[model samples]
Target: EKTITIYTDGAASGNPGKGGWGALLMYGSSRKEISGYDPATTNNRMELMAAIKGLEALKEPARVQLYSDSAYLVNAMNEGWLKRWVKNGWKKPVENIDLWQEILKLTTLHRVTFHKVKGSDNPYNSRADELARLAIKEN
Candidate 1:
């Protein structure tokens, strides 16, 4: 099966200030990079945004390996935290239930494997982080 690789990062100027998300997608010899900014948001939201945008960019379902630095995201998937939260009617008062719902809905349509990495220490990861920061950079 052909597989796709993705690296993603999200950052915020003040946690609730301007925020941005970055993602790099690769399949075979082709590559795509994407980013977006929000006037006011949290880092976690951007993080989720990165993943969501990356997955949403796929034209068709493919084996996906997604990398990110957010333990909140990685653990939630690897440990099945998202499953329980949804089962309980998402009553955990989680901050980004809306994004979670979107991600979960997307997951149902595609197979994605989450990998946790220290983006600050990796070139690809850092590149994604840089793009994220740049997206919201002050003029």
Candidate 2:
């Protein structure tokens, strides 16, 4: 199996504020990085986007280990929170439904495992975070 690991991160000035996202994908010795900003968006949204974008970048299905610092994002997938939320017509007044849905769709296309780690512990994770912090524009 062609396997790769992706590290992702997101940041915002406030709960609802300018936000940025970052991701890095590794396959053997090759690496691809991605990042973006939104003038008005939440950190969680960016977090989800980093995962979505990273997975979307794959040319075909691969064994993917997706890493993120956000427990909100990781737990949703690992703990089956997403399935319940969707099963109830998304009526929990959930935030980031659109992004969450996109991520859910993308995950099925590949073998994805969600992993949570301290953002500061890994060099590649730090690299991803730096890109996100650089992309953010505070008010």
Candidate 3:
């Protein structure tokens, strides 16, 4: 089976401010970058959205290694928090249940491995962060 590595990041001017998300998709020798902006959103929302959008770009289920700097995104899977949230219909007194649902749908379509990387450390992470910031600046 084919495999890919995805690096994602998100940025917001304020807690609930202009925000953007970005992802770097890598497969063998090729790489693609994707990014977008939202008028009013939270960083956590953008962070999850970046992962969802990247996974959704795949045509079919594949082995995927997803890297992100957000603990909220990575820990949800790594720490098994999402399972409990799902058991509760995603109504775990959360602020962004909608984004979580979107992420849940995308994750179901692929075999994904989540990795928590330190922010601003990896080159891909830095690049995606720049793209996300650029996206927000365009707004």
Candidate 4:
């Protein structure tokens, strides 16, 4: 099976105001970009949406490497934070519980490995950031 590479990013004009999420999926020479805007949301929520939307785009279960600039997002999955949250019955206060649950479900559908990326270091990451910010302005 081919491994899919995905780059994701999120942006918000105000921390809790208008927000947007973007993702770029690559399989060999093929590339796909997806993005969305939320009228009222947080940056973290947008970040989660970027990954969820990107993973959900897959037609079937497959290997995936997801890159994001959000440490919160990468740490949750990469460092087993999300596993602990689920194991503890989610007693801890977590913002964007709905989105987290959706992402968790997607994880079961795909073999996803999380990686932390910096926008300055990767053009794909920067493009995803650009797409996210543009979504906020366009929508």
Best by TM-score: 4
Model 3 clashing residue pairs (backbone): none
What's the lDDT for all of these models?
0.88, 0.88, 0.88, 0.90
Best-to-worst ranking by TM-score: 4, 3, 2, 1
Cα RMSD to native, each candidate? 1.4, 1.7, 1.2, 1.0
Q: Each candidate: how many clashes?
A: 0, 0, 0, 0
Q: Compared with the true structure, what per-residue lDDT tens digits does model 3 show for residues 1-139?
A: 6799999999987878999999999998899999999999889999998998889878778889999999999999889888889897766287688888887787777789999998778899888899899999888
**lDDT of each residue in 11-115, candidate 4, tens digit only:** 887878999999999999999999999999888889999999999988888899999999989999988889888888775487777888999899999999999
lDDT of 2: 0.88
Candidate 1: which stretches are off by over 4 Å? Answer: none
For 94-130, candidate 2 gives per-residue lDDT tens digits of: 8888998898789789899999987597998898888
**Candidate 1: lDDT of 19?**
93
Per-candidate TM-scores read 0.93, 0.94, 0.94, 0.96
Best by lDDT: 4
What is the C-alpha lDDT profile of model 1 across 1-139, one tens digit per residue? 5589989999987868899999999887788999889999988899999999998988887788999998889999999999999988887387799999999987877789999996576777788888898899842
